[PDB]
């Protein structure tokens, strides 16, 4: 249940066949790792790995660089207030969190030579036989953790802090716009219930409702967030790049900022490659159409017109086929993207995060959203278009075997069915499916002087586990606001059924990290970053597609000047509450800025106190016509016309006697 | 045609009922000017007046006052560095200008006893007497400057640096504002001459256009114009603020940022008299809204209707009545606005002038377009609601003198007539009538020792001319870039007549400061302010207006759904260049700022230059056994396993060994 004081774990496993090569690979490896000053030890693991264990030799050597990494960053703006020295008074005042040791290890074990520590990263270097660098959990605290966490009814903030401390800025940051999320999902879930059961199926004010709550939540986590990124104190670390080792240059250009110069990529490569990204996109929207017509037009043939041979659940079953088909189209669509992004270099791990948030975004919102949209925007105005598939099916069934009646309320029972099937879904392959494959890997399953078989036991069944990426519960609570915010007048308790999700999901991710995964090497952001992004165009979005729903599946006609009305009155609704609410909060004066200008202030004020009259008139004035004695010079007359003072206050007065007798 | 070196003057009227206590007054006055080391004279005015003329006496006080300066704008990051000391090597480094020099000396001269100056300000305290407070012009400059802006084609970067350095950072952050504006203004001159010839009467071509170039030149002036601030080492002035002397307090609340604690006006009295403005506009609209429909359906009524007694040009005679009639209440609109402004109190200046812009803006915006729209709007869409008006003109010109065939081409005529009108008369109000006004007062006006007769003179003169505000011309450039993009679909040559105008707009308003007006007191500022705030509500407004009115007079019948179509599809048109005109700037990489950060990390850079292995490894880690051996026990052993790196490499090999084996 306790560690034995291991930083960190390499995991580097060596090849039958490539030996004596990862042999040599190892040594110097070793070697280098001895040069940064960690203290190293060799273990046995399964499948020909030597699991290297790494720590801290000297405290003050750590300390060293936790000053140097302190200075790194208050030099680009991060830090408010220099460190001083290593008189260990430095961490007397700022303590080192875990977050931030294993950090600064991660970076004495990954940055090249240039920067102080050795490069073993694998993919760019001869470092091949590296497998992975991971560091290890603490079972007691994670015990503790999520104990306290399916105790709780809410979630303090001291609870979002010891994630911090424990698990980086980036997971942090997830746990909190998850709560935040949740507790700003609380307000339409009951204005759901109260416009589901008071107001009428497709109602008008729910869409409104909808998109104010939209815009007052995204902007309320703004300020929220750059309060967060104020308190932890890593605002502006998005300024600040960190330089991708997968990046292959041609040259190298001159220092832009720094001293130091930087290497470059020729971007109408990369800009060739941007454009190559469009066809997959395209191949994808039509790939996903054809697949989404294919499935509703036959869902719609066995259902309404094929009522003959097969039963109802036979006709109910082709849907959620799909459902279920798609998780594996959705996996090989993002490796695709995935590949896509690793095809191009992107010189900072930032913009390549970013367009892989992009890319993946795209393909998670056709396919999430396609099927909604093909059933409000096809199916219910005009699906007479797609009429001719039903005779296709109608023609393939009778020979197999040897009028359409199109309802406005078949897209509440799919909204319905998209909400429960995907939370029912996605709670099965989040967490029951892994920790059942754990455990039959366990069952599969069933030296080292027998101090440490229950340790090294634990070390090899954490090797196995996959890396926890956030940006993967960051896109399913995207979707989920999607859901939540253009899709919601269709099925008005949805936000409530997410609601009870949310909840469960804030505990579930929290046992994902726990069990059935191992620890993220701890990263420090400055925000969510292009989830703002992505979630200020589904509000956006969201908008105008509840007031076009709304309109068209309220239902002598659908008049094309009421939707076009209806859409223009919802998106300025939608633009002036923007600007409202972005008022309001520019109006709050949120505590944590007007702290960092106050200290801010406070230092530069003690750098400021770190650094009679007439007489002087009178004297450089005295100079002045001494100058004038020396040697143009009517000025010189006139400012010695009345030198003193006094001499003007008379001659003032007696200038107003003067104004006075004419 | 040189001035005596006078840094400022101060008026200070002497009534003649007000006697002595204007004369107790006046010595207290100089008994402060002495006090804050200013060299001070008095001379005779005309109308019972002392103008007294203020120097720095000691160089060595007014380089001491310019380094507090320098370290109170470095206190709050406006500027890059700190001024070290006044050992003469702060002015060697970066010199005064005259507009800081003499900003500091108004400051000197204006800023309460707390901040190190006398507080002479009139309004608020003893001070009645005090009239006004100027610098002078500088005559041979003055003409050297107009002669080299008239022989100019197009004006260099140079002459807005000079107009800086002599006259301050809102002066010159008009006169680059006008450049650019009118440098931009080039481009739909151009194309609205290759749409009024080549393309048809109301062109939608020519609306997307607009909307295209009324975002990239507003983008482009806010990435000029944060270069510009970055440039004249004035951008984060908007941070920093100032507070008013005529700002009345009840009490007195702690420090927010700073050390020192501030006063305080309770803010619900603000937001009464906020919600009293109200009326005002609403009071405002209905009566500008009468008179243009009584003047507009007169108009209609003697053209159209009543061909009869009276001419043509007794037809045309009203509407051109109007147009003169419009800067006599706008005038009384712009001065019941100001008054209500000084109504409430704003403490920081910033707000103050922000809330008369949004006032000012308001009025003009009603005066300047609800002819244009009442013609656009109602006139042709809808033109039968009036007609009463043509019944109600007929009964009453029967009874004095003892079928409305509606054109789209009306609106064409108003506008070229609104363009022309407009500024011919404004140039006959802006320069033409106060230059023959002063001409008049010269012929109506036709001691000292004979040296300064003709100084004096002009100074006397200098005293009537009302002082310079920046903000008409800012308010006139921005009407007409508003008539640019929400009514030049109407007239497409209209921009190119724009054109024209703004050139010799460029000189006329460098006329109007250099004989016409007194020199304004220079501050600085960082933008133009609320006026990039009302140029984007201009343009966004522009769009839907522009394609509302090239849909309704483009003219089986007119339908809603095309109006709302064309409507949408410019807005969302205008978002989505909006969007892309914004990525390209942000991609554009401006020098100003680059060299900044750039600078700013050289000097943190400097200041970080003011700032074997595994020996130190099996050191530790023999202090660690020594630890151990003083007294847990499996880390402890487990660590002492393999203590050197070498024991560790050669474990390594016989494990590679031990797997081959098995
Ligand atoms: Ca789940
Ligand atoms: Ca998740
Ligand atoms: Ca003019
Ligand atoms: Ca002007």
Not at 210 to 225: A, H, N, P, T
Not at 326 to 343: D, R
Not at 588 to 597: A, I, T, V, W
Request: proline share 4%.
């Amino acid at each position: 249940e306790s560690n034995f004081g291991v930083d960190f774990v390499i995991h580097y496993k060596v090849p039958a066949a490539e030996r004596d090569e990862a042999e040599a690979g190892f040594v110097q490896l070793i070697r280098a790792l001895t040069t940064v000053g960690l203290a190293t030890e060799v273990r046995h693991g399964e499948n020909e790995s030597l699991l290297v264990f790494v720590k801290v030799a000297s405290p003050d050597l750590f300390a060293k660089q936790v000053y140097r990494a302190r200075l790194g960053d208050w030099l680009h703006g991060v830090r408010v207030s220099a460190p001083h020295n290593d008189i260990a008074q430095a961490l007397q005042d700022e303590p080192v969190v875990e977050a931030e040791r294993l950090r600064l290890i991660y970076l004495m074990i990954t940055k090249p030579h240039n920067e102080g520590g050795a490069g073993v990263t694998p993919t760019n270097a001869k470092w091949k036989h590296v497998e992975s660098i991971f560091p290890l959990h603490s079972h007691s605290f994670n015990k503790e953790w999520i104990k306290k966490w399916s105790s709780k009814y809410t979630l303090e903030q001291t609870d979002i802090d010891n994630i911090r401390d424990k698990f980086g800025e980036s997971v942090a940051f997830y746990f909190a716009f998850l709560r935040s999320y949740f507790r700003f999902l609380v307000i339409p879930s009951a204005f759901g219930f109260g416009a589901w059961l008071l107001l009428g199926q497709f109602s008008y004010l729910y869409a409104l409702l909808c998109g104010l709550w939209s815009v007052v939540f995204f902007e309320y986590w703004k300020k929220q967030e750059v309060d967060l990124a104020v308190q932890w104190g890593v605002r502006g670390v998005s300024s600040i790049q960190q330089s991708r080792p997968e990046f292959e240059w041609e040259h190298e250009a001159e220092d832009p900022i720094t001293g130091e110069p930087v290497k470059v990529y020729p971007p109408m490569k990369r800009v060739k490659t941007q454009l190559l990204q469009i066809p997959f996109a395209l191949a994808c929207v039509v790939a996903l159409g054809a697949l989404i017509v294919t499935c509703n037009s036959l869902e719609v043939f066995i259902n309404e017109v094929y009522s003959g041979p097969g039963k109802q659940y036979l006709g109910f079953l082709p849907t959620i086929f799909l459902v279920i088909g798609t998780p594996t189209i959705s996996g090989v669509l993002m490796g695709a993207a995935e590949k896509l992004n690793a095809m191009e270099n992107y010189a900072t791990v930032d913009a390549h995060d970013a367009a892989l948030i992009q890319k993946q975004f795209v393909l998670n919102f056709m396919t999430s959203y396609m099927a909604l949209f093909f059933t409000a925007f096809v199916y219910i105005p005009f699906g007479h278009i797609l009429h001719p598939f039903l005779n296709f099916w109608r023609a393939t069934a009778q020979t197999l075997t040897f009028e359409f009646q199109i309802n406005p309320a078949r897209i509440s029972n799919q909204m319905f069915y998209f909400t429960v099937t995907a939370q029912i879904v996605n709670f099965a392959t989040e967490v029951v499916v892994p920790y059942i494959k754990q455990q039959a890997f366990q069952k599969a399953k069933q030296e080292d002087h027998e101090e440490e078989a229950e340790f090294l036991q634990r070390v090899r069944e954490e090797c196995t586990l996959e890396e926890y990426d956030v940006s993967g519960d960051y896109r399913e609570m995207v979707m989920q606001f999607g859901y939540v915010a253009m899709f919601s007048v269709a099925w008005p308790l949805a936000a409530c059924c997410f609601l009870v999700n949310n909840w469960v999901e804030l505990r579930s991710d929290a046992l994902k990290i726990a069990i059935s995964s191992r620890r993220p090497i701890p990263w420090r952001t400055d925000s969510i970053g292009p989830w703002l992004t992505a979630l200020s165009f589904l509000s956006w979005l969201g908008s105008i597609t509840s007031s076009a729903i709304v309109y068209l599946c309220s239902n002598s006609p659908l008049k094309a000047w009421g939707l076009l009305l209806s859409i223009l009155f919802a998106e300025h609704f939608y633009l002036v509450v923007q600007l409202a609410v972005r008022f309001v909060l520019s109006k709050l004066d949120s505590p944590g800025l007007q702290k960092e200008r106050k200290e801010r202030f406070q230092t530069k004020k003690r750098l400021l106190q770190e650094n009679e009259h007439s007489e002087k008139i009178t004297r450089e004035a005295l100079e002045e016509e001494a100058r004038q004695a020396s040697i143009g010079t009517p000025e010189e007359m006139f400012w010695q016309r009345q030198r003193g003072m006094q001499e003007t206050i008379e001659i003032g007065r007696r200038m107003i006697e003067q104004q006075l007798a004419a």
